[PDB]
Amino acid sequence: LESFSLTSHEKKFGVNIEFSDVNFSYPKQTNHRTLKSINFFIPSGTTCALVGHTGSGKSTIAKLLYRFYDAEGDIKIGGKNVNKYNRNSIRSIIGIVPQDTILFNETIKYNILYGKLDATDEEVIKATKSAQLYDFIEALPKKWDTIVGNKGMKLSGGERQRIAIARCLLKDPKIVIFDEATSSLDSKTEYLFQKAVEDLRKNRTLIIIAHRLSTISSAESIILLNKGKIVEKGTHKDLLKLNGEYAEMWNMQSG
């Protein structure tokens, strides 16, 4: 098995992603599939939002890109089939910012550099400034050396996810998978999000798993899943005009 390699252009600007007639069920899910005849293509260096009710199969798409499970059908990165490569060379070009990040019981700086144990203090500062985490850390009583985790200072979900964003910028992958955990209790969370997304997206292919549709409206492509099937695809304006399920959700969430 080969090791995945990005072209020089791909390294500079990002890589495309395609799923072709992809079908999956989890090992214990012995009656039904979580994903059904999934076809989509993400152009390199663009953003793609995956939307849909819980159950739709949104997060399973990510797990298959990161090779957590094997699917039937074809997953291709940069036109190349992932089944020709060893898993670790695929994962090295993908960064996950999950809904919920578990912290090591260690300094905040240790938790960040885990993205790339190598990083210079300078790369670490830049990552933490992009993640919107620098003023939070400068204000801490031990700053960098503050012990976090479950013995240690407790961080919100928003804050832990900013560590995850920083880990990811340090990793510097060419694919970023970002499960959004903005809160409709506080509009600063979404503004922080976008500030991060702006830096995250820079010269990368970015997939956003969205639960709140407003985080996603300027995404170059939105894919709406309904029970494992992709039922609609396009940009925000087009999906509203379609007046289908994305328009229904959008209006419920808008009130």
Side-chain angles (χ1 to χ4, degrees), residues 1-137 139-153 155-189 191-201 203-255:
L1 288 189
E2 276 181 68
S3 263
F4 196 85
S5 336
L6 299 156
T7 82
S8 325
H9 200 266
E10 289 180 334
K11 287 162 175 134
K12 265 242 185 278
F13 307 110
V15 261
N16 63 227
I17 304 155
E18 182 166 23
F19 278 41
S20 314
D21 245 76
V22 159
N23 289 289
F24 176 77
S25 309
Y26 283 102
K28 302 283 272 175
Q29 186 193 17
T30 67
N31 298 289
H32 305 287
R33 49 222 155 111
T34 293
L35 294 175
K36 303 178 184 160
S37 276
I38 300 291
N39 296 287
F40 65 83
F41 173 86
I42 302 145
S44 64
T46 64
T47 144
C48 175
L50 305 176
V51 296
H53 295 310
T54 319
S56 75
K58 288 191 315 288
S59 325
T60 309
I61 285 160
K63 296 186 205 172
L64 290 185
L65 196 51
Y66 215 68
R67 301 285 296 107
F68 279 145
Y69 290 101
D70 297 310
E72 284 192 307
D74 301 301
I75 301 169
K76 294 203 223 207
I77 299 182
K80 300 122 109 95
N81 195 315
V82 304
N83 76 2
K84 303 175 220 275
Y85 311 84
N86 57 43
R87 318 188 343 252
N88 69 259
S89 62
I90 290 300
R91 292 174 171 158
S92 30
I93 60 160
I94 309 176
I96 293 154
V97 182
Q99 197 98 240
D100 211 287
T101 302
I102 318 87
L103 266 19
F104 308 109
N105 279 138
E106 245 294 358
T107 70
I108 182 155
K109 165 88 107 93
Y110 176 103
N111 266 282
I112 289 165
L113 278 171
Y114 181 67
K116 192 216 195 158
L117 231 62
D118 233 11
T120 67
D121 282 329
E122 320 101 61
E123 304 168 284
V124 172
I125 281 146
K126 179 164 96 287
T128 79
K129 275 182 182 169
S130 290
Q132 301 298 300
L133 237 201
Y134 185 89
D135 301 332
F136 178 89
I137 296 176
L140 288 184
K142 294 170 86 150
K143 307 189 183 195
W144 284 139
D145 230 39
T146 311
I147 292 147
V148 289
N150 57 29
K151 303 218 268 160
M153 174 190 297
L155 259 30
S156 54
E159 289 142 6
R160 307 200 305 282
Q161 204 180 48
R162 272 132 81 207
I163 300 166
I165 295 165
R167 284 175 179 185
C168 194
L169 293 181
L170 289 184
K171 190 162 175 187
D172 188 23
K174 298 323 295 201
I175 298 149
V176 176
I177 302 169
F178 195 157
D179 203 332
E180 73 81 16
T182 69
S183 175
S184 63
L185 289 201
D186 182 0
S187 111
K188 188 188 198 190
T189 73
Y191 160 76
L192 287 187
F193 180 64
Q194 232 57 77
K195 293 250 76 166
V197 160
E198 288 178 61
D199 276 86
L200 249 5
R201 101 221 303 193
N203 293 322
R204 294 183 187 96
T205 305
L206 167 71
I207 290 148
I208 299 152
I209 299 131
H211 308 279
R212 282 161 22 93
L213 266 23
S214 56
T215 67
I216 241 50
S217 73
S218 65
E220 277 110 290
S221 182
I222 294 159
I223 302 168
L224 171 59
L225 263 89
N226 187 303
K227 309 184 289 263
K229 282 126 102 102
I230 289 188
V231 301
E232 318 174 336
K233 194 178 301 169
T235 78
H236 182 71
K237 263 209 202 59
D238 293 343
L239 287 193
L240 289 180
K241 183 176 329 304
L242 184 56
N243 203 243
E245 295 170 49
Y246 174 92
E248 196 218 350
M249 302 198 155
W250 177 268
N251 290 319
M252 293 213 96
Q253 289 192 353
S254 214

